[PDB]
Design a protein around this ligand. Structure first.
Ligand SMILES: [Mn+2]
Length: 1057
């Protein structure tokens, strides 16, 4: 939907988290919607090796970003239902056209469709990659890999949704399953929301090389929390039982109604002009003038939906009777609508009051006139008129008492106030037949579109007064219903479709709700028939060359295929296919891939270039995947005992952890590039209330920072305007020192507080109290081994500051990856047969196998020395060349700067001359440099020849080895990160998983620190299926940026002996 991510992002400004090598949450399941990848990898013709090189690299990249623990689910598009074939066929036709039109004059992308010759190979290739991976990447070895390829009918998106819905439907489903779906389509956010699984993210890529691309976790846990805040404002006004999950479901129907992939958009919604606030507002008001929800688990209530429609119709109508439409106009429309809802609900309430008022006189009259029929003499000699709605009595006491006064009555009660009633005011008194007339007079007293419009609408339908409109209309309304069912329950029909290119006017949808809608499940086309129902006589050559409905000229007003006419026109030519085409023109199954050490088979490669066979180390089988449905219902909404808010698993965000107040406002929030011109959910944070015992309680202990995304950190000091509380390790117990601030600390503190409060307002719509203190913290960056074999919390060296009000003391669910652990015995910490990294001079970085133990402190191993030849030399050589070739000086700045300041002065010149000079950009963080492009290539050439000199390996039985000559690279990310790296330094990939085969050497060509996280740029010895040429700088795929935790540095050996 057109501004949907943009609009959602600005309005609810904390929903998404940049992935930047800091810890992200653990996930149970990752689902890949892959079709965007295949496209994106087959443009920028390049070769099959290079093409699949990319795709493997992409799938692999996303798999390592998440590290799913249970299920990894890959999906490609099978044959779609008819509801999509017109657009499938419009898209496809535009590609063939644009190819011929553009490029050709001034690879056939359409091959990526099911049944195609390309796609039969793709499945052969991908399968190979999966097998290679499950054989060699340890991380890929404890998950279910499930491939649902193009052989199987349905959209990836939809196939994924059917899996999630099938597993959540069970009676043993983990209630707090952490879900992640990768994909570019904003719609996934809505499908995600549709599942009602709180612990759910979307892997996405930016929207303003692979290792330097930005990816985000969009967090549905906090989005839901924001949504709850969006709609809570009612709770008290709706005429049914308020339920957020049901509200959310209706908000989803509204979102599908606004846009979805199948029906065409309703005309003039004006999204890219700020109707969005208004459309929502529409829903908000509608929800209050209805008898229950619009959406019964995907079933639509048309009666209900037309109450919402009426608002949408007024919307259409008012905006026709406007000139241009802009934000200014929608902002004032938003106000008017709110004001109307307020007025309307006030009248509604006056009406209710008046009704109660009438029943009341209506019940009093006969008992009053009988009471006043008896003249007084000389209290219990009368009937009392009890009143029963105490709560409503109590809200109406001035009235009741004035009523009582007027009719000559008292409003009485009881000491315990459990009974109210009227009674004659007897203590207040003859032709007093004037009391009976005064009573009677008192009782009497209380008993008191446009036409230019229709035409302008008619001139729309003509362009692209009847009852074939009832037919259009009803097709559209049917559609909405097909869409919702599709998403909440599964494809309801392989054959339903919207038979028109355009949507009706909003104010007309009404004509089409007077229907009873059912569907017939049907069955999907065979591949080749779909192949024909889509594809133009311009990419005819992907269809088995053997075969109107196919223009050369064509909002794409491409004709709709007559299906009946088509299955038949092909069945002549049906029996003439190969055995491979009868293979391609059928359906497959989902496949499942398992790891099994006792499997040892040879897997042939369907690829050239850098790929080979998977040898005596091949370890996967494929199988058909079932699913096991039964007499099982789907589960709609949250599962029983699902943890939400402050009880969410670690890693996932929550607003519920602090105490706060939320309000929609024009906060000019700056989520992207310019300040939003619409309201944000502004968060007003409440201070928690000593400041001395606070310091004493938490100093040097673990407190939670980053609010929104609470991670553990250690509290270092507690700045204040006039006082610093510091932490000093006294050995065992760290204690608190209080002192006045130094001038720069008092400077920093004032400059910091002002900077935080406005950044939180401008960037996140968090309105802070005003900064009391300031917790200074460092975050937990892993675990780390101590001498005694124990493992304990490690911390990032970089100081961060947070207002104290955003500091949380504790959290129910703690990040398991950071539970400190006690020492272990040799045989458990390095079990017999375990594979390990040998430190120590014989083979620094050698593959080691634990054979047994000599002692209970010494162990014996087999160490493979992977090479008997000296490490190559150039990196080092070149590093010193560059540094000698480009000397730096202190102000009292590089020789190339000297030449630029001597060029500018000698020309006296400007200005553009300077902008011209600025073209070759050397723009990067402070500790991070590079080898000269020259050097880079010299390193490449001198490697290419090194890696073809004769060379051999060598093993050695070793014994009496002390535990610290060996390490588990697996669980030493911190140690490894702690290593210097310099340009030229020889390096080895040391990790049992990732994108480089174990033990590969390379040279460091340049480092790049994104603050705290270092990324080493490695020119590898051998080519790497996952690498690149560092954007031309190289001539082969030897290049890769990588995190230091993957690398042993062999030049500057920092862990030897
Ligand atoms: Mn979509």
């Amino acid at each position: 939907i057109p501004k949907f991510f943009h609009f959602i992002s600005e309005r609810w400004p904390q929903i998404s988290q940049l992935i930047d090598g800091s810890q992200i949450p653990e996930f149970d399941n990752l689902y890949l919607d892959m079709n965007s990848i295949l496209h994106n990898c087959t443009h920028g013709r390049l070769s099959e090796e290079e093409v699949y090189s990319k795709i493997f690299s992409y799938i692999d990249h996303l798999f390592h970003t998440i590290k799913p623990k249970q299920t990894f689910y890959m999906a490609i598009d099978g044959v779609a239902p008819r509801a999509k074939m017109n657009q499938q066929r419009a898209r496809r036709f535009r590609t063939a056209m644009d190819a011929e039109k553009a490029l050709q004059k001034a690879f056939d992308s359409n091959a990526i469709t099911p049944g195609t010759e390309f796609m039969a190979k793709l499945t052969e290739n991908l399968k190979y990659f999966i097998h290679d991976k499950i054989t060699n990447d340890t991380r890929w070895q404890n998950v279910k890999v499930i491939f649902s390829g193009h052989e199987v009918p349905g959209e990836g998106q939809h196939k994924i949704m059917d899996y999630i819905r099938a597993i959540r439907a069970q009676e043993d489903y983990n209630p707090n399953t952490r879900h992640c779906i990768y994909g570019l389509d904003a719609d996934l956010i809505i499908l995600g929301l549709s599942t009602h699984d709180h612990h759910f993210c979307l892997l996405r890529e930016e929207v303003t090389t692979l290792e330097t691309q930005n990816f985000f976790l969009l967090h549905l846990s906090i989005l839901r929390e924001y949504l709850a805040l969006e709609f809570e404002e009612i709770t008290d006004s709706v005429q049914f039982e308020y339920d957020f999950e049901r509200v959310l479901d209706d908000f989803i129907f509204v979102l599908f109604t606004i846009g979805n992939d199948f029906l065409p958009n309703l005309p003039d919604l004006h999204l890219k002009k700020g109707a969005f606030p208004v459309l929502l507002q529409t829903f908000k008001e509608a929800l209050q003038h209805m008898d229950g929800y619009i959406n019964e688990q995907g079933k639509i209530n048309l009666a209900r939906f037309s109450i919402w429609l009426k608002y949408l119709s007024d919307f259409e109508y008012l905006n026709f009777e406007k000139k241009d439409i802009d934000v200014e106009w929608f902002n004032q429309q938003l106000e008017n609508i709110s004001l109307e809802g307020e007025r309307k609900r006030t009248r509604m309430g006056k009406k209710l009051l008046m009704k109660q008022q009438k029943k009341l006189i209506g019940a009093v009259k006969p008992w009053l006139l009988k009471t006043v029929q008896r003249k007084v003499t000389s209290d219990a000699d009368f009937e009392i008129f009890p009143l029963e709605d105490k709560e409503l009595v109590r809200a109406n006491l001035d009235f009741l008492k004035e009523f009582a006064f007027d009719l000559g009555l008292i409003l009485a009660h009881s000491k315990s106030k459990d009974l109210y009633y009227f009674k004659l005011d007897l203590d207040s008194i003859x032709x007093x037949x004037x009391x009976x007339x005064x009573x009677x007079x008192x009782x009497x007293x209380x008993x008191x579109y446009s036409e230019r419009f229709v035409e302008w609408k008619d001139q729309y339908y003509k362009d692209k007064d009847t009852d074939s409109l009832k037919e259009m209309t009803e097709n559209y309304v049917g559609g909405l219903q097909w869409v919702l069912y599709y998403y909440y329950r599964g494809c309801p029909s392989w054959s339903w479709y919207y038979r028109y290119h355009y949507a009706p006017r909003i104010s007309d949808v009404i004509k089409g709700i007077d229907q009873n809608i059912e569907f017939h499940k049907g069955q999907p086309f065979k591949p080749f028939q779909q192949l024909m129902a889509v594809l133009p006589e311009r990419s005819k050559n992907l269809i088995p060359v053997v075969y109107d409905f196919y223009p050369n000229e064509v909002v794409v007003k491409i004709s709709f295929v007559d299906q009946k006419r088509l299955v038949e026109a092909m069945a002549p030519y049906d029996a003439k296919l190969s055995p491979d085409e009868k293979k391609r023109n059928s359906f497959g199954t989902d496949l499942i891939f398992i790891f099994n050490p006792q499997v040892d088979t040879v897997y042939k490669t369907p690829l050239a270039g850098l790929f080979n066979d998977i040898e005596h180390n091949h370890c996967i089988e494929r199988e058909f995947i079932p699913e096991s449905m039964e007499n099982v219902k789907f589960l709609f909404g949250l599962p029983k005992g699902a943890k939400l808010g402050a009880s969410s698993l670690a890693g996932f965000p929550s607003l519920k952890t602090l105490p706060l107040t939320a309000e929609l406002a024009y906060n000019s929030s700056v989520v992207f590039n310019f300040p939003s011109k619409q309201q944000s959910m502004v968060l007003h944070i409440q201070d928690l209330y000593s400041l001395s015992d606070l310091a004493k309680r938490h100093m040097g202990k673990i407190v939670y920072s980053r609010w929104p995304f609470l991670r553990e950190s250690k509290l270092l000091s507690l700045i204040t305007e006039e006082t610093v509380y510091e932490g000093v390790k006294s050995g065992k117990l760290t204690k608190v020192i209080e002192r006045k601030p130094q001038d720069f600390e008092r400077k920093e503190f004032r400059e910091l507080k002002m900077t935080l409060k406005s950044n939180y307002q401008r960037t996140k719509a968090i309105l802070l109290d005003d900064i009391s203190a300031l917790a200074k913290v460092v975050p937990v960056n892993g675990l780390v081994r101590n001498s005694d074999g124990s493992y304990s919390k490690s911390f990032n060296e970089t100081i961060e500051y947070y207002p104290l009000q955003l500091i949380v003391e504790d959290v129910k669910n703690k990040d398991e990856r950071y539970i400190e652990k006690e020492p272990l015995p040799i045989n458990k910490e390095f079990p017999k047969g375990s594979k390990v990294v040998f430190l120590g001079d014989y083979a620094y970085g050698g593959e080691a196998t634990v054979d047994g133990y000599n002692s209970e402190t010494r162990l014996k191993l087999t160490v493979k020395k992977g090479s008997l030849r000296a490490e190559p030399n150039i990196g080092k050589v070149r590093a010193k060349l560059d540094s000698q070739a480009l000397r730096f000086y202190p102000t009292q700045x590089x020789x190339x700067x000297x030449x630029x300041x001597x060029x500018x002065x000698x020309x006296k010149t400007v200005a553009d001359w300077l902008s011209e000079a600025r073209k070759p950009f050397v723009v990067v963080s402070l500790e991070s440099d590079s080898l000269t492009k020259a050097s880079m290539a010299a390193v490449e050439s001198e490697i290419i020849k090194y890696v073809s000199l004769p060379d051999s390996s060598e093993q050695k039985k070793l014994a009496k080895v002390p535990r610290e000559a060996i390490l588990n690279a697996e669980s030493s990310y911190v140690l490894l990160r702690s290593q210097r790296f310099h340009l030229g330094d020889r390096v080895m990939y040391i990790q049992d998983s990732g994108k480089v085969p174990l033990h590969s050497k390379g040279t460091v060509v340049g480092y790049t620190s994104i603050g705290k996280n270092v990324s080493i740029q490695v020119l590898f010895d051998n080519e790497i299926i996952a690498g690149n040429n560092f954007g031309g700088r190289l001539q082969t795929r030897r290049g890769l940026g990588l995190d230091s935790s993957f690398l042993l540095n062999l030049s500057d050996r920092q862990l030897v002996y």
